[PDB]
Amino acid sequence: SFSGYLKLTDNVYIKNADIVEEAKKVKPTVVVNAANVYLKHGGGVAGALNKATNNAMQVESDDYIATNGPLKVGGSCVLSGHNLAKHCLHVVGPNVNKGEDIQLLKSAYENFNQHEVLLAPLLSAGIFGADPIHSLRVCVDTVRTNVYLAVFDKNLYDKLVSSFL
Numbered sequence: 001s002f003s004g005y006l007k008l009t010d011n012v013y014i015k016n017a018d019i020v021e022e023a024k025k026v027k028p029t030v031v032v033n034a035a036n037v038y039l040k041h042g043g044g045v046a047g048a049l050n051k052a053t054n055n056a057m058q059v060e061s062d063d064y065i066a067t068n069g070p071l072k073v074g075g076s077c078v079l080s081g082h083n084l085a086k087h088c089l090h091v092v093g094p095n096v097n098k099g100e101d102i103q104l105l106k107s108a109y110e111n112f113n114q115h116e117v118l119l120a121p122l123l124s125a126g127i128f129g130a131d132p133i134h135s136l137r138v139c140v141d142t143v144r145t146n147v148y149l150a151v152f153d154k155n156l157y158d159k160l161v162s163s164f165l
């Protein structure tokens with residue numbers, strides 16, 4: 001069971017935590033990856049999750065792309081969670097540093113509704129360049145299933161909580 005989360009709404013919870021450490025402790029049914037369309041898990045959340053799998057996530061992902069081609073921005077795929085979770089839901093939020101449409105963030109969060117409970121980061125935050133405050137608002141207004149958000153940066157976590165409405 002998830003522990004130490006602050007309840008923001010009926011279905012959204014948040015914690016200042018490293019999502020890799022959280023996944024290793026909880027072993028959730030679903031961990032969300034902040035993926036790109038190519039499933040190239042180089043940095044940010046994706047790089048960290050992939051490193052924690054000893055690159056097994058990347059190997060699996062490369063086979064997935066070779067068979068299926070790239071994901072769409074706003075889309076997702078379900079792959080193995082390896083040693084971190086039962087499944088990994090790879091979700092592609094828009095990357096503002098690539099000029100992608102921030103309106104696709106809502107479509108990205110809609111993928112979460114296909115899973116009753118998820119451990120997730122804020123989509124499009126961090127190296128994806130979107131405002132994490134906006135990402136949290138889109139999350140709360142889009143996701144209806146139970147989502148446990150892990151925010152690594154304590155300063156950002158405090159800002160997210162203190163500005164939540």
Ligand SMILES: CC(=O)N1[C@@H]2CC[C@H]1c1cccnc1C2
Pocket residue numbers: 017018019020044045046048049121122126150151152153
């Ligand atoms: C150390 C650090 O900044 N991070 C790790 C992996 C990506 C980033 C991060 C973001 C959100 C939740 N957990 C985490 C934990």
